[PDB]
Amino acid sequence: DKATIPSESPFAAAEVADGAIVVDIAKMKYETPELHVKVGDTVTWINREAMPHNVHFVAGVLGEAALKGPMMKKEQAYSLTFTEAGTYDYHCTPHPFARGKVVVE
Ligand SMILES: [Cu+2]
């Protein structure tokens, strides 16, 4: 895979690592729809609203299978550690109008 998953479960926003690279989700959108990170960086999404959201990378993007993240409730977080340079598009499973990408460089 081109990502590893610290926690299969969402976790609390206060449990996000110090100095984490955070993408907030609010207004049914990713607030940073294009994020550039380095190989080895961990990205953390944090849902800032009540409606549940996830991140979903279709098959072939981060690995052979789709990486369908867990649904995050308000003030829950989810992290992925990116291990290979490339451009990785994602969307929210129930809300596929909401799209983003991580560019790993
Ligand atoms: Cu959503």
Structure-token match 């294009």, residue found: 34
Cβ–Cβ under 8 Å, residues 9 and 15: no
Q: Are strands 95-104 and 34-37 parallel, antiparallel or unpaired?
A: parallel
The DSSP secondary structure of 64-98, one letter per residue, reads SS-EEPPPB-TTEEEEEEE-S-EEEEEEETTEEEE
Determine the distance separating the centroid of ligand 1 and the alpha carbon of 96, expressed in angstroms. Answer: 7
Cβ–Cβ under 8 Å, residues 50 and 77: no
State this model's resolution in angstroms. 0.9
Cβ–Cβ under 8 Å, residues 32 and 23: yes
Contacts of 104 (CB under 8 A, 6+ apart): 36, 37, 38, 39, 41, 82, 84, 85, 86, 87, 88
Q: Which one-letter DSSP state was computed for residue 53?
A: B
Experimental method reported for this structure: X-ray
At residue 35, the 3 state secondary structure works out as strand
Distance CA 27, CA 29 (A): 5
Determine the distance separating the centroid of ligand 1 and the alpha carbon of 50, expressed in angstroms. Answer: 10
Two tokens, residue 84: 């290979």
Determine the distance separating the centroid of ligand 1 and the alpha carbon of 1, expressed in angstroms. Answer: 24
Q: Residues 1-105: name the CATH superfamily.
A: Cupredoxins -  blue copper proteins (2.60.40.420)
